C-alpha cells in the first residue's frame, strides 16, 4: 500500500514542532540498567573488604595483606572498620584523594636514628597476634629510663621523585600519663622542609571511650620534592615515620560500592556495577570511571530510525 502497515506496537517519539508523535520504528538512546557485578577486566580492581585506604596505608593489623598493593580502581565497602589505636586525620578527604590518585602503596623503609628514647611502642587495643602491637608504618617513641631529650633528625632527598612521609602526634588523657610517657609537661613537633613547616602541640584532655582508650592520635603528612631536605624536631608526643611511600602520577581513583566482582569486560564502572557503552547517554550515576556515557536526568529518550506510523 502506502509504505507502512501501521505496526500494532506504536513508537512515541519527542519532537520540537509537536511534542510526542507516533512513528514506525524507534531506538533507545539511554542505557538505564546494570548487570549488578563489577568486571575485573581490563582494569585492575582492588577490593578493600573490611579496610579503608587510610587503614591499609597505616598498617592496620587486619589488612596487613594489603602491603604494596597496586590498584587501578579501589573499591571501598561500607562494612569497613578499624581495630587499632584510635586516631584522627586533619584534612581527611584531601589525603584520601591524594593517596587514591597515586595508585601505589609501595613503602620504602628508611633508617632514622632516635637516640635517648625507647622505640617500638605498643598498645593493647592494637593486638598484632597474641601480644600488644601498633601500626606497622609508625614508631612510637617514649622516655628512656627517666628522660626524653629533644629529638632532632634530618633526611635529604637526592632522588628524582617525590616522597610522602606520614607522621603523627599523641594526645594523652590525663596529666599523669603525659609525664609518665614524656617527662616534659608539654610536647611539640616541628617538621620542616626548605619551603614549608608544620608545628603541632598535643592537647591534653578527656575523650569518649573508644575500644578501651581515651587518648587520641592525630595524623599528618609531608611531601618532599627532589633536591629538598626534611628536619624533624620534637620533645614529646611524636609518632615517628619508618620510611616513605613512592609517589606516582597516572590514572587512578576510588569509588564506594557494595557490588561483587566478576570476570567480565566493560569499560565504565559506576557504584552500581559495570555498564555497556554502546549508547551515548546513561541514567544510572553521575559518578563514573573509564570511557563512560554522560549522565542525563531523563529516563527514556527515543531516536526515530524510520517513518511515521500513520498517514497524513
Amino acid at each position: 500500500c502506502l509504505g507502512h502497515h501501521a505496526v500494532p506496537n506504536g513508537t512515541l517519539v519527542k519532537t520540537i514542532t509537536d511534542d510526542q508523535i507516533e512513528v514506525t520504528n524507534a531506538t533507545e538512546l539511554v542505557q538505564s540498567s546494570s548487570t549488578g557485578k563489577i568486571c575485573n577486566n581490563p582494569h585492575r580492581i582492588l577490593d578493600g573488604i573490611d579496610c579503608t585506604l587510610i587503614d591499609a596505608l597505616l598498617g592496620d593489623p587486619h589488612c596487613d595483606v594489603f602491603q604494596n598493593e597496586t590498584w587501578d580502581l579501589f573499591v571501598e565497602r561500607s562494612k569497613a572498620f578499624s581495630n587499632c589505636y584510635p586516631y584522627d586525620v586533619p584534612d581527611y578527604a584531601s589525603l584520601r584523594s591524594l593517596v587514591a590518585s597515586s595508585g601505589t602503596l609501595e613503602f620504602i623503609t628508611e633508617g632514622f636514628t632516635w637516640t635517648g628514647v625507647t622505640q617500638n611502642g605498643g598498645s593493647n587495643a592494637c593486638k598484632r597476634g597474641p601480644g600488644s602491637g601498633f601500626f606497622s608504618r609508625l614508631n612510637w617513641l617514649t622516655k628512656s629510663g627517666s628522660t626524653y631529650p629533644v629529638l632532632n633528625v634530618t633526611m635529604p632527598n637526592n632522588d628524582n621523585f617525590d616522597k610522602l612521609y606520614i607522621w603523627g602526634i599523641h594526645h594523652p588523657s590525663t596529666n599523669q600519663e603525659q609525664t609518665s610517657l614524656y617527662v616534659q609537661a608539654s610536647g611539640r613537633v616541628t617538621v620542616s622542609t626548605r619551603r614549608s613547616q608544620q608545628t603541632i602541640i598535643p592537647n591534653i584532655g578527656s575523650r569518649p571511650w573508644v575500644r578501651g582508650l581515651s587518648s587520641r592520635i592525630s595524623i599528618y603528612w609531608t611531601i618532599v620534592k627532589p633536591g629538598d631536605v626534611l628536619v624533624i624536631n620534637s620533645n614529646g608526643n611524636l609518632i615517628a615515620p619508618r620510611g616513605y611511600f613512592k609517589m606516582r602520577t597516572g590514572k587512578s581513583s576510588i569509588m564506594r560500592s557494595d557490588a561483587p566482582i566478576d570476570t567480565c569486560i566493560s569499560e565504565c564502572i559506576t557504584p552500581n556495577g559495570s555498564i555497556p557503552n554502546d549508547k551515548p547517554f546513561q541514567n544510572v550515576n553521575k559518578i563514573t570511571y573509564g570511557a563512560c556515557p554522560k549522565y542525563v536526568k531523563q529516563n527514556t529518550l527515543k531516536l526515530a530510525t524510520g517513518m511515521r506510523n500513520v498517514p497524513e
Binding site: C1, L2, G3, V13, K14, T15, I16, T17, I21, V23, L29, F281, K286, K294, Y295, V296, K297, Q298, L301, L303, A304, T305, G306, M307, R308, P311, E312
Partner: protein, 133 residues
Amino acid sequence: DLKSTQAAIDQINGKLNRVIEKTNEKFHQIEKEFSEVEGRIQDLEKYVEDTKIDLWSYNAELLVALENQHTIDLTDSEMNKLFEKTRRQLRENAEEMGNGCFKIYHKCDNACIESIRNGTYDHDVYRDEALNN
C-alpha cells in the same frame, strides 16, 4: 599591704576568668560561623551541579529533537515524492482513497505490481476495465 596584694590577685584572677570565658565563647561563635559557611558552600556546589545537569540534559533533549525533526522531514518528503510519482504513473486505472493509498478497480497479476514497483507501467491495457469498474 598584703591586703592590697590579695585584692590585686583577686582582680587579676577575675580578669583572667573574664578573658578565658570571652575567648571560649568567641571561639564557639567562630566555629559555628565556620560550619554555616561550609554548609553554604556545600549547597552552592549542589546548586551548580543541578544547574549543569539540567542544562546538559536539555541540550541532549533539544539535540535529539532536532535529529528526529530532520529524519521525519526527509522521510515523509521522499514518501510524498514517490507517492506523487506513483500517482503520475497511476493516472486512470486506480484512485487514491485519501490516505495516500490507491484503491484499484481492476484485477491484475503480480506482474502488474512488479511493473508498478519498477516504474514501467502502461495504464491503458486496463484503463477500459478500470472505467468499467
